Paper text:
We have previously identified the chemoreceptor [name] as the first bacterial receptor that exclusively recognizes purine derivatives via its dCache_1 domain mediating chemoattraction to these compounds. By combining analysis of the newly solved 3D structure of the [name]-LBD in complex with uric acid and comparative protein sequence analysis, we identify a sequence motif for purine binding in thousands of dCache_1 domains (termed dCache_1PU) deposited in public databases.
The individual [name]-LBD was generated as a his-tagged fusion protein, purified, and crystallized in complex with uric acid. No crystals were obtained for the apo protein. [name]-LBD adopts a structure typically observed for dCache_1 domains that is composed of a long C-terminal helix and two α/β type PAS folds that are termed membrane-distal and membrane-proximal modules. Well-defined electron density was obtained for bound uric acid that enabled to precisely introduce the ligand model. In interpreting these binding interactions it has to be taken into account that the protonation state of the N7 atom of uric acid is unclear at present.
Residue numbers in the entry: 7 to 251
Write the structure that this text describes.
């Protein structure tokens, strides 16, 4: 019942819903690549070179149509990793840079969301990966990557008022997307808010969470609202004097 009859809860929800739409496009598009039954069959049947150019054309089309930084699939049998330009490299369990792939397939989880360094380019990206399965048997992984600098830019444009800031935080407290790109995937929520307020907005149900915190004697309000499709939380920070406008 805090701020219920204020415009603030609806304003945060409108931001939350816009962020879910924009993240929803790569979620959906990456799922389409992994679920593509023609690709599943090509991976299961051993990556016939005769059809490889046409699957690279397909990844290129999906990247451009969906404005992704990169699109990709990898075979769990050969370790071969393909992106929109072709066969890039072979993964290996003994290489720490490939931990993401083996951890994910070992996990069996239906989806992987991960901030990581793109192996082909060295760029910080948000990756979305799904299992590729045939008759129950894992044959690959596929998905797409988004450039972290672009995501920070998108989160920054949702700033509001004089000092209203918005963050996307994994439900463990690590800030995934920060308006200042330097801190995306690197800053803990406690660094931004203080431990009490971080705990406050990260603890709760599916309704708006809130907590007060002080920043050099300036009183602030912290808000939290879960995303429905990701295990992430939208966190907003606004000075108390800005609550109304
Ligand atoms: O978590 C990751 N998912 C990927 O799809 C990918 N691709 C890549 O090069 N590195 C990573 N990391």
């Amino acid at each position: 019942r805090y701020l219920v009859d204020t415009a603030l809860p609806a304003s945060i929800e409108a931001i939350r819903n816009d962020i879910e739409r924009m993240l929803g496009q790569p979620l959906v598009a990456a799922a389409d690549i992994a679920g593509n039954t023609l690709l599943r069959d090509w991976l299961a049947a051993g990556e016939d070179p005769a059809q490889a150019p046409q699957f690279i054309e397909y990844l290129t089309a999906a990247k451009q149509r969906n404005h992704a930084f990169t699109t990709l699939f990898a075979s769990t049998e050969t370790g071969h990793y393909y992106n929109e330009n072709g066969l890039d490299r072979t993964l290996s369990r003994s290489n720490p840079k490939d931990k993401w792939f083996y951890g994910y397939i070992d996990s069996g989880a239906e989806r992987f969301i991960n901030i990581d360094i793109d192996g082909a380019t060295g760029e910080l990206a948000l990756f979305i990966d799904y299992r590729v399965e045939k008759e129950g048997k894992l044959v690959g992984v596929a998905g797409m990557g988004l450039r972290m600098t672009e995501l920070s830019k998108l989160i920054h444009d949702f700033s509001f008022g004089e000092h209203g800031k918005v963050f996307l935080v994994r439900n463990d407290g690590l800030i995934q997307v920060h308006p200042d790109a330097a801190f995306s995937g690197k800053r803990q929520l406690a660094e931004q808010l203080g431990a009490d307020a971080a705990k406050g907005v990260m603890t709760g149900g599916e309704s708006l969470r809130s907590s007060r915190f002080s920043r050099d004697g300036e009183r602030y309000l912290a808000l939290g609202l879960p995303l429905r499709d990701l295990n992430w939380t939208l966190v907003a920070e606004v000075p108390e004097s800005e609550i109304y406008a």
